[PDB]
Design a protein around this ligand. Structure first.
Ligand SMILES: *[C@@H]1O[C@H](CO)[C@@H](O[C@H]2O[C@H](CO)[C@@H](O[C@@H]3O[C@H](CO[C@H]4O[C@H](CO)[C@@H](O)[C@H](O)[C@@H]4O)[C@@H](O)[C@H](O[C@H]4O[C@H](CO)[C@@H](O)[C@H](O)[C@@H]4O)[C@@H]3O)[C@H](O)[C@H]2NC(C)=O)[C@H](O)[C@H]1NC(C)=O
Ligand SMILES: *[C@@H]1O[C@H](CO)[C@@H](O[C@H]2O[C@H](CO)[C@@H](O)[C@H](O)[C@H]2NC(C)=O)[C@H](O)[C@H]1NC(C)=O
Ligand SMILES: *[C@@H]1O[C@H](CO)[C@@H](O[C@H]2O[C@H](CO)[C@@H](O)[C@H](O)[C@H]2NC(C)=O)[C@H](O)[C@H]1NC(C)=O
Ligand SMILES: [Ca+2]
Length: 475
C-alpha cells in the first residue's frame, strides 16, 4: 500500500533527476519541454541544491554524492545576475544547511566523504558572507535585490513583508552552527521591526500587519493585510521559530497567536454559493478582497502546526477548514489540480464561469499550475496532526494528477489551464521546488516515521523552512 506509493514517488523524483542530469546539470534548472537548461537562480545549480534534502530523505546516495561534489566547486561570489536575498536564502542557504543537519544526524550512514558534508557548512558561511552587506542599511531592514559584485542595489525604498520576515530561520541556524552570532543578529534585527509594528495604523487588527517596510526607518509603508504571496512566509516563520527554540523565541509565538486569532475572526470568508467552504480574504482599509492564491494554501499547515504545538484545538479545527477549502479547488477542476488564483466575490463572477461558480464555490482567475507544493504541504500536516487516512489519500490523488498531466520525457512541466484536457499547454519550465517540495511532501506522506517527519505536540526535532528543507531544532 503505502510502501508501493512511496516507491512510486521515488520513481517520479528519479525521473526528473535523470532528465535534469541529462540535459541541464549543473545549470539552475531543466527546461522540460525543449530539454534544455535555464539559470533563473544566479547559476549556482538551484535544482541540485534544492533536491539535496529530498534525495537524502529518500536514501538515494548516488544523487546525494553528485550534489555534494557540485556544492564543493560552487563559487558563490560570481554571478552575472542580480541576487534576491530571499530566494537565495530559502533555497541555497537552507538547502545546504538542511543537508548538513540531516547527514550529521538521522542520515549519518548515507555518505562516506565527511569532507563533502562539512563543506556544506563552510559554503553556507561563504554564501552568507557574500550576502550580508544587504543588511547594512539605516534600519537594518535589508535590500532584497542586490548586486554582489558592486555592493549596489535596486534603489528600492521599501522591502516586502515576506522577503523581510522569511530569513530569520536559516540565518539564525547558521549562527548556532558556526558560533558566529553575526548572522542571527542581522536577521533578527530586521525581524524586530515586524514584531513591534509602527505606525499602529499599519496593524489593522492585533498581529496582522502591512505588506511593505521602509528601509530607512523600519516603519510600515502600508496597511494592506494578507496571507497571499508577498506576505505569507512572514506568518509561517513566526510559529516555526518558536518550534526551533521555544526558550529564545517565545515572543515570536505570542505574535503568531495574535495573528492566528485575528485571522480567524476577520479574514475568514465563505463563498455565497458554498457557505460550507472557507478561504481567507485580504484586508486593506475596512474593505475586503475576496480572492486567494495557491500560495496562500500553506495557511492550513501553519494553523495545524501551531495548533498541535500549542495544543489549541481551535487552531487545528480552523486549519482543517482551510485544508478542505484548498482541496476543493483541486478536486473541482478537470485535471484535479487546483488553479494558481481564484475569487468568490458574487459581484465579479465571470459570465462564462457562472455555473462553475454556483457549484464549485469560486471562479478561476488564473488556471495555470506551476508545480507549486502548498496544497500538498498542508495535506501532509493534516495527516501528521490528525492521523486520518483521508488527508494522505488527497496527497496521493494530487500526486497522481500531477504525474499524469505534467510529466514529460525529461521531467515535469508547468501547465497553462488546470480546467482543460491535459492541462491545456505545457510551459517550458520546471522550478527548483519540484525537487525540494512537491516530491518531498508527497513521499513523506507515505513513507515511514522518522525524526524528519512532522510530529505532534512538542516532539518535533526538525522544523521545515519555507522551501521544505528540514532544519534541526536548537540545542
Ligand atoms: C473534494 O473536496 C471537498 C471539500 O474539501 C471534500 O469534502 C469534504 O471534505 C472533508 C472530508 O473528510 C469533510 O470534513 C469532515 O466533515 C465532517 C462532516 O461535516 C459536517 O458536519 C459538521 C458538524 O460537525 C458541520 O460543521 C459541517 O458543516 C458538515 O455539515 C466532519 O464530521 C469531519 O470532522 C471530523 O474529522 C476531523 C478530522 O478529519 C476532526 O478534526 C473532527 O473533530 C471530526 O472528528 C470533517 O470536518 C468536509 O466537511 C467535506 N467538505 C464539503 C464542503 O463537502 C471532498 O471529500 C473531496 N472529494 C473527493 C472525492 O476527494
Ligand atoms: C553589478 O555591478 C557591476 C559593477 O562592478 C557591473 O559590472 C559591469 O558593469 C558594466 C555593465 O555593462 C560593464 O562595465 C561590465 O559589464 C561590468 N564591469 C564591471 C564594473 O565589472 C554588473 O553589470 C552589475 N550586475 C548586473 C548585471 O546588474
Ligand atoms: C506516473 O507516470 C509514469 C509514466 O506515465 C507511470 O509509469 C509508467 O511507466 C511505463 C511508461 O512510462 C509503463 O510501465 C506504464 O505506462 C507506467 N508504469 C506502470 C504502472 O506500468 C507511473 O506509473 C505514474 N505514477 C503513478 C503511480 O501513477
Ligand atoms: Ca513555502
Amino acid at each position: 500500500s503505502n510502501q508501493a506509493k512511496a516507491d512510486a514517488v521515488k520513481e517520479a523524483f528519479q525521473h526528473a533527476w535523470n532528465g535534469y542530469m541529462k540535459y541541464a546539470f549543473p545549470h539552475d534548472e531543466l527546461t522540460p519541454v525543449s530539454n534544455g537548461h535555464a539559470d533563473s537562480r544566479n547559476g549556482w545549480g538551484a535544482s541540485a541544491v534544492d533536491a539535496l534534502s529530498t534525495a537524502v530523505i529518500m536514501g538515494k546516495a548516488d544523487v546525494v554524492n553528485a550534489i555534494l561534489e557540485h556544492v564543493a566547486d560552487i563559487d558563490f561570489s560570481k554571478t552575472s545576475d542580480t541576487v534576491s536575498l530571499f530566494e537565495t536564502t530559502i533555497r541555497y542557504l537552507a538547502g545546504m544547511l538542511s543537508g548538513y543537519d540531516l547527514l550529521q544526524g538521522p542520515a549519518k550512514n548515507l555518505v562516506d566523504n565527511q569532507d563533502l558534508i562539512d563543506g556544506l557548512l563552510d559554503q553556507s558561511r561563504n554564501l552568507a558572507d557574500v550576502l550580508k552587506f544587504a543588511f547594512d542599511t539605516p534600519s537594518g531592514v535589508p535590500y532584497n535585490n542586490i548586486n554582489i559584485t558592486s555592493h549596489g542595489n535596486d534603489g528600492a525604498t521599501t522591502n516586502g513583508l515576506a522577503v523581510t520576515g522569511t530569513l530569520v530561520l536559516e540565518w539564525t541556524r547558521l549562527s548556532d552552527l558556526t558560533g558566529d552570532e553575526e548572522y542571527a543578529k542581522l536577521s533578527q534585527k530586521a525581524e524586530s521591526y515586524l514584531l513591534k509594528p509602527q505606525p499602529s495604523s499599519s496593524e489593522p487588527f492585533p498581529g496582522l500587519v502591512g505588506s511593505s517596510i521602509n528601509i530607512n526607518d523600519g516603519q510600515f509603508a502600508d496597511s494592506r493585510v494578507s496571507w497571499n504571496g508577498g506576505d505569507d512566509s512572514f506568518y509561517e516563520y513566526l510559529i516555526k521559530m518558536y518550534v526551533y527554540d521555544p526558550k529564545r523565541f517565545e515572543t515570536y509565538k505570542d505574535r503568531w497567536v495574535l495573528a492566528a486569532e485575528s485571522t480567524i475572526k476577520h479574514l475568514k470568508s465563505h463563498p455565497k454559493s458554498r457557505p460550507d467552504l472557507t478561504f481567507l480574504s485580504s484586508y486593506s482599509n475596512r474593505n475586503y478582497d475576496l480572492s486567494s492564491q495557491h500560495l496562500t494554501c500553506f495557511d492550513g499547515g501553519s494553523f495545524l502546526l501551531g495548533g498541535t504545538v500549542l495544543d489549541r484545538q481551535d487552531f487545528i479545527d480552523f486549519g482543517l477548514e482551510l485544508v478542505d477549502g484548498c482541496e476543493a479547488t483541486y478536486n473541482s477542476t478537470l485535471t484535479k489540480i487546483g488553479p494558481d488564483s481564484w475569487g468568490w466575490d458574487p459581484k465579479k463572477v465571470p459570465s462564462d464561469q457562472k455555473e462553475f461558480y454556483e457549484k464549485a464555490g469560486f471562479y478561476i482567475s488564473s488556471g495555470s499550475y506551476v508545480l507549486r507544493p502548498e496544497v500538498i504541504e498542508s495535506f501532509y500536516y493534516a495527516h501528521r496532526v490528525t492521523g486520518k487516512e483521508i488527508y494522505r489519500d488527497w496527497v496521493w490523488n494530487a500526486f497522481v494528477a500531477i504525474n499524469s498531466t505534467c510529466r514529460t520525457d525529461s521531467g515535469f512541466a508547468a501547465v497553462s489551464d488546470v480546467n482543460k484536457a491535459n492541462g491545456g499547454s505545457k510551459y517550458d519550465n520546471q522550478e527548483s521546488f519540484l525537487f525540494a517540495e512537491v516530491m518531498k511532501y508527497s513521499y513523506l506522506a507515505h513513507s515511514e516515521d522518522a525524526a524528519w517527519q512532522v510530529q505532534k505536540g512538542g516532539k518535533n526535532t526538525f522544523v521545515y523552512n519555507t522551501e521544505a528543507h528540514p532544519i534541526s531544532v536548537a540545542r
